[PDB]
Design a protein. Structure first.
Lengths: 107, 124
């Protein structure tokens, strides 16, 4: 699906994904993630692979734009993300963006 | 028709330093995010660094982070790229460009108004 974000088109909005379970190195944080993960994205905004020369740049945009857009939309519904929430969203959305890169790369 | 023009390129020894400039015509410089890209023969144009309209945030590609510094002088319609600890792999034509949309990104499609470029060659 094509998309416009922040006034720029040429984005794609990926499919709704099975959001991975991320581990953080304590059981507490792992449980916090399980209890909160429904608040985090399950789909990612990205741009065509050919607009980058490397994987890290593709993934950086995907993480950055996805979380920006998610924060806008969810703020309008009364959400507020803690520092911990932001960190955890960065980690899961990074994984989902790397998975998407690998789909683009094998195509 | 805002026009961008790069300058400051040259031939630099490895480990050397160069400062590039990007001069903008017109009267809306400070209203737009801006970025630097580079292109070497055989490769496509790739992200180097970016800076928001107000200068409040900047961004870099991994391979130049810590060596290169982007800045802008909003009173003088000019952006700069300070390139330190230059390496052979930094050889390229460097382009400045104006951001599209409200967010600085790394993608080629995030910018337009490309200048004609300035050549940087780092010897080896």
């Amino acid at each position: 699906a094509g998309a416009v974000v922040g006034g720029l088109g040429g984005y794609m909005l990926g499919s709704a994904m099975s959001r991975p379970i991320i581990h953080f190195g304590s059981d507490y944080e792992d449980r916090y993630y399980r209890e909160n993960m429904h608040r985090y994205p399950n789909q990612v905004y990205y741009r065509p692979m050919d607009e980058y020369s490397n994987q890290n740049n593709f993934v950086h945009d995907c993480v950055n734009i996805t979380i920006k857009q998610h924060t806008v939309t969810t703020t309008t519904k009364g959400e507020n993300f803690t520092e911990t929430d932001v960190k955890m969203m960065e980690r899961v959305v990074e994984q989902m963006c790397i998975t998407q890169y690998e789909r683009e790369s094998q195509a | 028709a805002a026009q961008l023009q790069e300058s400051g390129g040259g031939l630099v020894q490895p480990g050397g330093s160069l400062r590039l400039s990007c001069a903008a015509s017109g009267r809306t410089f400070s209203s737009y995010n801006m970025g630097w890209f580079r292109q070497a023969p055989g490769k496509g144009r790739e992200f180097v660094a970016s800076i928001t309209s107000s200068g409040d945030k900047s961004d870099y590609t991994d391979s130049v982070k810590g060596r290169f510094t982007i800045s802008r002088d909003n009173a003088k319609n000019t952006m700069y790229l300070q390139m330190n600890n230059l390496k052979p792999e930094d050889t390229a034509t460097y382009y400045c460009a104006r951001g599209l949309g409200i967010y600085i990104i790394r993608a080629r499609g995030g910018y337009d108004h490309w200048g004609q470029g300035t050549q940087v060659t780092v010897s080896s």
